[PDB]
């Protein structure tokens, strides 16, 4: 934080756009618009070490911009397109509501 | 623009809009009073009420 509020072209990723592969683009942010994403463990590390050991804290405590989670992976993505063959796979899928798969 | 009839059970009164009834929203308030370790400080125990939990 406050790397973000400098005029910089290093922090976007506009090179992955269609017409903007090479060349730069500068942008900033306003602190009404930055949020961080983390897991809950170092959120708690912020909530004891950086805020309670720190004697003077009255302007610094940026925990207002923090959202966390239990785990940051619980999902699954597919690389190779494939087909269903096994009956227990059908049973396990409609165990979670996927009735329509055959 | 074209009127025609505007009278059909579905795809009339269904193709343009319908009544949004639920909202799938945060009335069970979370990240504000939930996801909150910001409690009090002092003399302690027994702030633990449980309900009949039929609902």
């Amino acid at each position: 934080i406050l790397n973000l509020q400098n005029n910089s072209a290093k922090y976007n990723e506009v090179h992955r756009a269609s017409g903007g592969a090479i060349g730069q683009y500068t942008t900033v942010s306003k602190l009404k618009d930055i949020v961080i994403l983390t897991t809950d463990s170092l959120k708690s590390y912020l909530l004891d070490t950086k805020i309670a050991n720190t004697f003077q804290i009255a302007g610094i405590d940026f925990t207002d911009h923090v959202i966390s989670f239990d785990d940051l992976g619980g999902v699954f993505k597919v690389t190779k397109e494939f087909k269903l063959q096994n009956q227990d796979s059908i049973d396990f899928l409609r165990a979670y509501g996927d009735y329509q798969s055959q | 623009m074209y009127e025609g009839n505007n009278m059909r059970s579905m795809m009339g009164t269904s193709y343009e809009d319908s009544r949004l009834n639920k909202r799938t929203e945060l009335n069970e308030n979370m990240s504000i009073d939930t996801n909150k370790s910001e409690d009090s400080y002092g003399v302690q125990i027994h702030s633990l009420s449980k309900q009949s939990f039929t609902g």
Partner: peptide, 12 residues
């Protein structure tokens, strides 16, 4: 025009 605690909590 300086302001402190730039967050503004919104509820429903």
């Amino acid at each position: 025009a300086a302001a402190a605690a730039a967050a503004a909590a919104a509820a429903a």
